[PDB]
Structure 1
Amino acid sequence: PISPIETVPVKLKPGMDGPKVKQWPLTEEKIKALVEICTELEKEGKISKIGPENPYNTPVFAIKKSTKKLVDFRELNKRTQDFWEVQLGIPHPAGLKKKKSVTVLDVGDAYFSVPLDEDFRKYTAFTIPSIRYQYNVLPQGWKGSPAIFQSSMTKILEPFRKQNPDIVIYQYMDDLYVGSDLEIGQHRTKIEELRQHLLRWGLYTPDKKHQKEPPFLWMGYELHPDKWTVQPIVLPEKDSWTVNDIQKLVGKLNWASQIYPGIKVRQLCKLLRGTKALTEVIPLTEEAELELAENREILKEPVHGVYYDPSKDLIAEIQKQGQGQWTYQIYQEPFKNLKTGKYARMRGAHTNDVKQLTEAVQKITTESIVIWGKTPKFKLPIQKETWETWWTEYWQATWIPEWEFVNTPPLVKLWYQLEKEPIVGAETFYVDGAANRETKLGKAGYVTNRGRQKVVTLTDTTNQKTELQAIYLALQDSGLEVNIVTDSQYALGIIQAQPDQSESELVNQIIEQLIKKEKVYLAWVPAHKGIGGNEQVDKLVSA
């Protein structure tokens, strides 16, 4: 199975140098195993004898237990130059186009069939304990074998690809999936042309008798040449459940959330709190028994999908499934999905549904460009008016590809709006907050044009925390309308940004007050200046 394929030039990292590792003096029991092995090997072409000139050497072994050799090239690896990354991204079902037929050739010992850079060839020396040999083909587990093989493979297919453009090949690992639209006899015939072709260059593949049959499993899916399916998975039942046990369940259920709806893992997840060991056994609660059940049913329903049709539009629709959470599906024919997924509640310092929705869209657009090299038409649960309103009031640059409204509650909206101008007849609060940086002691509070005022001492606080506090107070103690003037450009920013979701207790308490009011106008002024009002609170929140 020697190849007539030109070799790829190799070199060791600069400065580095070939291995010169000693050779074990193991028993002649294994020797005779090697002597033979290597001989046929030798006369097979794979290796060749040597002697005086190769001062390099790597430990070689003979193994019994397979009850009927393993060279270790680790040291040669951390010596070899780096090669170009091997395709790391791979095909996803929803990206393929339907076929009449699909076969998968198994490039077996593909590796050992490929020549090794005659030059670099020496460093692969090893001696059989009392014959010196050299490798001549890509060795198992050596740095460059994967990369190099894939390429060589790519070449050998070039002509054939040019001549049979209606044929489609996918190289992966030690596999060649070939599908087409020809007739079942014609298809069978073509495949045999490939075999011979490959056979031509020293790469043997089994025949139609010794093959593998459809469908084929690919990262969760079962693939037919006409459609695909998702094997209904199983959730074992029992009394004993280690933490480890529970973690795994969560994992499986989690991946299925993508494909199946109403999947939940909360109560089942709230079961790892406190755990002291992976071997620990948490008594399955009730809600965690009830939930584990609902999921089992839902998982019994089969799921069928279709492939891609280049002559049709792509279309994605998104849904607000609770705070921070979103669901989407992509199709070309109403009801007939290509792919669907879910995005877990991104949780930040402060955002809103409009901002969140924007990212989901972006992620989906990135995804799409990679599957199809296109971007779908969006259908969204947001008003066109809401979008124009946010677009103008927001500082960051923002955008959404062509889309159209799809009334389908819950819609995504803005939970409150700030006044563009102050309010006539509304109270006016001037708020401040100060905190020491060496003791972290602080004071918050306000004064108004209606005589009233309040202050408040704090502990373990900071400048931005107290500053936000002053505002909460004011919001808290007042009518349905209000004018608020603060000197913290920090707190202005957060709010100016009309946030509706956050991890801070305080920000939320504020967001809540804000949602309540009838009219709110937030205003800013330089700190510590003469500016009346501000110099009152300024004095009260100091000590």
Structure 2
Amino acid sequence: PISPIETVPVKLKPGMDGPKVKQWPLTEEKIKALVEICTEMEKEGKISKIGPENPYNTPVFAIKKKDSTKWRKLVDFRELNKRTQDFWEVQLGIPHPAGLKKKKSVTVLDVGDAYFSVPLDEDFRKYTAFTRYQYNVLPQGWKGSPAIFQSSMTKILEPFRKQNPDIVIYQYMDDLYVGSDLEIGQHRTKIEELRQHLLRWGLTTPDKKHQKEPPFLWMGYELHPDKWTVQPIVLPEKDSWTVNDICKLVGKLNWASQIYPGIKVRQLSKLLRGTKALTEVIPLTEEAELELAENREILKEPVHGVYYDPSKDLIAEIQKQGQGQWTYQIYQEPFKNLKTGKYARMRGAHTNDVKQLTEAVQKITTESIVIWGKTPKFKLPIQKETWETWWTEYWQATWIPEWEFVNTPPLVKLWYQLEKEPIVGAETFYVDGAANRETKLGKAGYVTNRGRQKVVTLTDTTNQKTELQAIYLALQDSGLEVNIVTDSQYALGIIQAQPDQSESELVNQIIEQLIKKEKVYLAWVPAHKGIGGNEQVDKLVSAGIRK
């Protein structure tokens, strides 16, 4: 029927009015499906007939439901949504089965005719006109229908939740997961109390969508009594993938990484750079062909998750793969994963593996607070000494919650360390770079305290690139130990962060040199202040491109 719940007052945006769009032709099979629905809805008071006194109109269409038998009536309210007010969405996330606690009895039931059972604001029904009826209930394709149904459902369940605080009801759209610590027979009674409570508010629960035995179909999973699994994921077997086919592959792999450990999508996602066409085809690289093959081998293996025990602690263990990728597993008992995941977001032009580990810990922590409301204890592949070295010398405030080291390679380490004091017996290089804004010409070079001088001319460069080119030049022409003095806090700040990877090949070449060195000391002096021998190198690189 129609819910006797109060309607949600909805207004339009100021200075705007209803939509006025005509209807497009449709197939006879779709016209039959609509007249079979509109005539029955009109008798249920869900849609009311109008006349010439309603200048508004909106085109409609119909598609096949998940059951592939009944027709879902969709309206193209794309013009009404532009002129409809803004709502605050109440659906703050997606429930995950790893956050479900163990219950003795579980029921998964859906509400029949969700939108079409919740009344619509009377003053707003004018704009919902279509050729002629108008919606008296929540229509599909409207901006406010999801938020209004989700809030109305919460209003309806509120008396039942207050009366039954120990029955857990996972409410997502019209689907209801109901768990209880009661015996099977006493649980069935509580379900009927819930079905009678919903029916009181005009919400029906047809038996066709009333699951009573495991495995329950819920949110794309299969809920068993002591475990859960994800519905099968078929990867598109093709020969020449396109831009749209790669997203379908990566999007499914990301969905699979929630329970399948070891999923990587770096090189696959890297192939979508610079493209501007959805149907564009791209030659698949060889490093991505190996990445897709090993992903396929994991999905062939079976895997499943467990449920959350509040009495036990949460444990998250992170492994490391190449290309700056990370995989994690959250469990409470060894080799009984509640959930898995992956992290591979490149943050920053320059970074190392300790930053990336810190970022993965933060992502997992926030993710764990959503699902379980608490923070997990970590198992990180980094030595306590390596972490103490980093956070003591790093200028930013960084921190990792309670964790423990695990001897599972590849270990996370810093590939080089800058000296704190100048190196005795090491040649002192005074580097500097300069570039011209107009001609884009520049010169990088150095001056040593032993008489050596070199100046390298550069074309199509910037002032900051010449400073890095000078440091790179000193590293190339020095021994295993070297002192470098630069006037560039840009280049100093980059190198002092101890990066091991960069979007810049110039920095990558600098990183490769710094790992070969045994001792490096980098100092900073102000530019254009007569300090030697920064004054000597400044005159060399400025000759011909400045003043």
What's 1:179 paired with? 179
Query: Is the 2:161–2:167 Cα contact (8 Å) retained in structure 1?
Result: yes
Query: Is the 1:484–1:523 Cα contact (8 Å) retained in structure 2?
Result: yes
Closer, same or farther in 2 for the Cα pair 1:323/1:428, shift >3 Å?
Answer: same
Q: For residues 325 and 31 of structure 1, what CA distance do their matches in structure 2 show?
A: 52
Using the TM superposition, name which of 151-160 and 302-311 deviates more. 151-160
1:365 Cα deviation from its structure 2 partner = 0.8
Which ranges in structure 2 are unaligned for 5 or more consecutive residues? Answer: none
Q: For residues 423 and 25 of structure 2, what CA distance do their matches in structure 1 show?
A: 94
Q: For residues 287 and 466 of structure 1, what CA distance do their matches in structure 2 show?
A: 33
Confirm whether residue 267 of structure 1 aligns to residue 267 of structure 2: yes
Closer, same or farther in 2 for the Cα pair 1:117/1:277, shift >3 Å?
Answer: closer
Closer, same or farther in 2 for the Cα pair 1:312/1:455, shift >3 Å?
Answer: same
1:47 Cα deviation from its structure 2 partner = 5.1
Q: For residues 62 and 463 of structure 2, what CA distance do their matches in structure 1 show?
A: 71
Closer, same or farther in 2 for the Cα pair 1:470/1:336, shift >3 Å?
Answer: same
1:268 Cα deviation from its structure 2 partner = 8.0
1:118 Cα deviation from its structure 2 partner = 3.7
Q: For residues 137 and 78 of structure 1, what CA distance do their matches in structure 2 show?
A: 20
What's 1:80 paired with? 84
Q: For residues 171 and 344 of structure 2, what CA distance do their matches in structure 1 show?
A: 33
Closer, same or farther in 2 for the Cα pair 1:298/1:367, shift >3 Å?
Answer: closer
Closer, same or farther in 2 for the Cα pair 1:247/1:166, shift >3 Å?
Answer: closer
Q: For residues 33 and 423 of structure 2, what CA distance do their matches in structure 1 show?
A: 95
Closer, same or farther in 2 for the Cα pair 1:101/1:493, shift >3 Å?
Answer: same
1:483 Cα deviation from its structure 2 partner = 1.5
1:394 Cα deviation from its structure 2 partner = 1.4
Spell out the pairing of 1:187-198 with structure 2 (5 A cutoff).
Answer: 187-198=187-198
Using the TM superposition, name which of 321-330 and 232-241 deviates more. 232-241
1:179 Cα deviation from its structure 2 partner = 2.3
1:315 Cα deviation from its structure 2 partner = 0.9
Using the TM superposition, name which of 306-315 and 382-391 deviates more. 382-391
Closer, same or farther in 2 for the Cα pair 1:176/1:516, shift >3 Å?
Answer: same
Q: For residues 29 and 253 of structure 1, what CA distance do their matches in structure 2 show?
A: 37
Q: For residues 61 and 196 of structure 2, what CA distance do their matches in structure 1 show?
A: 35
Using the TM superposition, name which of 141-150 and 85-94 deviates more. 141-150
Using the TM superposition, name which of 371-380 and 97-106 deviates more. 97-106
Query: Is the 1:347–1:503 Cα contact (8 Å) retained in structure 2?
Result: no
Query: Is the 2:91–2:150 Cα contact (8 Å) retained in structure 1?
Result: no
Query: Is the 2:108–2:210 Cα contact (8 Å) retained in structure 1?
Result: no
Closer, same or farther in 2 for the Cα pair 1:179/1:530, shift >3 Å?
Answer: same
1:218 Cα deviation from its structure 2 partner = 4.8
Please list the CA deviations of residues 5-28 of structure 1 after superposition, one character each: whole Å capped at 9, or x if unmatched.
233333333333456789999999
Please list the CA deviations of residues 46-87 of structure 1 after superposition, one character each: whole Å capped at 9, or x if unmatched.
455777987767789999999999877655544433333141
1:453 Cα deviation from its structure 2 partner = 1.9
Query: Is the 2:431–2:534 Cα contact (8 Å) retained in structure 1?
Result: yes
Give identity over the alignment, percent. Answer: 99
Using the TM superposition, name which of 422-431 and 14-23 deviates more. 14-23
Closer, same or farther in 2 for the Cα pair 1:177/1:455, shift >3 Å?
Answer: same
Using the TM superposition, name which of 390-399 and 70-79 deviates more. 70-79
1:190 Cα deviation from its structure 2 partner = 1.9
Query: Is the 1:483–1:520 Cα contact (8 Å) retained in structure 2?
Result: yes
Closer, same or farther in 2 for the Cα pair 1:198/1:29, shift >3 Å?
Answer: closer
1:490 Cα deviation from its structure 2 partner = 1.8
Q: For residues 28 and 372 of structure 2, what CA distance do their matches in structure 1 show?
A: 60
Q: For residues 198 and 329 of structure 2, what CA distance do their matches in structure 1 show?
A: 41
**Secondary structure at the counterpart of residue 78 of structure 1:** helix
Confirm whether residue 388 of structure 1 aligns to residue 391 of structure 2: no
Closer, same or farther in 2 for the Cα pair 1:147/1:496, shift >3 Å?
Answer: closer
Query: Is the 1:3–1:115 Cα contact (8 Å) retained in structure 2?
Result: yes
1:510 Cα deviation from its structure 2 partner = 1.6
Using the TM superposition, name which of 404-413 and 459-468 deviates more. 404-413
Using the TM superposition, name which of 531-540 and 276-285 deviates more. 276-285
1:242 Cα deviation from its structure 2 partner = 7.0
**Secondary structure at the counterpart of residue 108 of structure 2:** strand
Q: For residues 401 and 411 of structure 1, what CA distance do their matches in structure 2 show?
A: 19
Length, aligned pairs only: 539
1:464 Cα deviation from its structure 2 partner = 1.5
Q: For residues 274 and 138 of structure 2, what CA distance do their matches in structure 1 show?
A: 51
1:100 Cα deviation from its structure 2 partner = 2.5
Please list the CA deviations of residues 205-256 of structure 1 after superposition, one character each: whole Å capped at 9, or x if unmatched.
2137975864344555322243101345445767787776676445544543
Query: Is the 2:443–2:541 Cα contact (8 Å) retained in structure 1?
Result: yes
Query: Is the 1:100–1:226 Cα contact (8 Å) retained in structure 2?
Result: no
Closer, same or farther in 2 for the Cα pair 1:126/1:409, shift >3 Å?
Answer: closer
Closer, same or farther in 2 for the Cα pair 1:193/1:37, shift >3 Å?
Answer: same
What's 2:103 paired with? 99
Closer, same or farther in 2 for the Cα pair 1:470/1:223, shift >3 Å?
Answer: same
Query: Is the 2:56–2:127 Cα contact (8 Å) retained in structure 1?
Result: yes
TM superposition score normalised by structure 1 = 0.84
Which ranges in structure 1 are unaligned for 5 or more consecutive residues? Answer: none
Query: Is the 1:221–1:229 Cα contact (8 Å) retained in structure 2?
Result: yes
Q: For residues 118 and 339 of structure 2, what CA distance do their matches in structure 1 show?
A: 39
1:339 Cα deviation from its structure 2 partner = 0.9
**Secondary structure at the counterpart of residue 202 of structure 1:** coil
Query: Is the 1:343–1:360 Cα contact (8 Å) retained in structure 2?
Result: yes
Closer, same or farther in 2 for the Cα pair 1:476/1:3, shift >3 Å?
Answer: closer
Query: Is the 1:10–1:120 Cα contact (8 Å) retained in structure 2?
Result: yes
Q: For residues 298 and 3 of structure 2, what CA distance do their matches in structure 1 show?
A: 53
Closer, same or farther in 2 for the Cα pair 1:535/1:317, shift >3 Å?
Answer: same
Closer, same or farther in 2 for the Cα pair 1:372/1:15, shift >3 Å?
Answer: same
Query: Is the 1:232–1:299 Cα contact (8 Å) retained in structure 2?
Result: no
Q: For residues 43 and 390 of structure 2, what CA distance do their matches in structure 1 show?
A: 76
**Secondary structure at the counterpart of residue 371 of structure 1:** helix
What's 2:158 paired with? 158
Using the TM superposition, name which of 19-28 and 193-202 deviates more. 19-28
**Secondary structure at the counterpart of residue 542 of structure 2:** coil
1:371 Cα deviation from its structure 2 partner = 0.8
Please list the CA deviations of residues 341-380 of structure 1 after superposition, one character each: whole Å capped at 9, or x if unmatched.
1112626421111111111111111111111111011122
1:402 Cα deviation from its structure 2 partner = 1.7
Query: Is the 2:442–2:458 Cα contact (8 Å) retained in structure 1?
Result: yes
Using the TM superposition, name which of 49-58 and 438-447 deviates more. 49-58
What's 1:450 paired with? 450
Query: Is the 2:261–2:328 Cα contact (8 Å) retained in structure 1?
Result: no
1:298 Cα deviation from its structure 2 partner = 3.5
Please list the CA deviations of residues 489-521 of structure 1 after superposition, one character each: whole Å capped at 9, or x if unmatched.
221111122222112222122212211222221
**Secondary structure at the counterpart of residue 401 of structure 2:** coil
Closer, same or farther in 2 for the Cα pair 1:190/1:356, shift >3 Å?
Answer: same
What's 1:67 paired with? 69
**Secondary structure at the counterpart of residue 41 of structure 1:** helix
1:485 Cα deviation from its structure 2 partner = 1.5
Using the TM superposition, name which of 71-80 and 172-181 deviates more. 71-80
Query: Is the 1:99–1:226 Cα contact (8 Å) retained in structure 2?
Result: no
1:463 Cα deviation from its structure 2 partner = 1.6
Using the TM superposition, name which of 312-321 and 25-34 deviates more. 25-34
Q: For residues 252 and 279 of structure 2, what CA distance do their matches in structure 1 show?
A: 19
Q: For residues 27 and 505 of structure 1, what CA distance do their matches in structure 2 show?
A: 58
Query: Is the 2:386–2:413 Cα contact (8 Å) retained in structure 1?
Result: yes
| Bigger Rg, structure 1 or 2 | 1
Closer, same or farther in 2 for the Cα pair 1:160/1:405, shift >3 Å?
Answer: same
Q: For residues 157 and 4 of structure 1, what CA distance do their matches in structure 2 show?
A: 14
Closer, same or farther in 2 for the Cα pair 1:440/1:294, shift >3 Å?
Answer: closer
1:99 Cα deviation from its structure 2 partner = 2.3
**Secondary structure at the counterpart of residue 398 of structure 1:** coil
Using the TM superposition, name which of 19-28 and 113-122 deviates more. 19-28
1:542 Cα deviation from its structure 2 partner = 2.9
What's 2:317 paired with? 317
1:431 Cα deviation from its structure 2 partner = 1.8
Confirm whether residue 108 of structure 1 aligns to residue 112 of structure 2: yes
1:181 Cα deviation from its structure 2 partner = 2.6
Closer, same or farther in 2 for the Cα pair 1:109/1:476, shift >3 Å?
Answer: same
What's 1:478 paired with? 478
1:191 Cα deviation from its structure 2 partner = 1.4
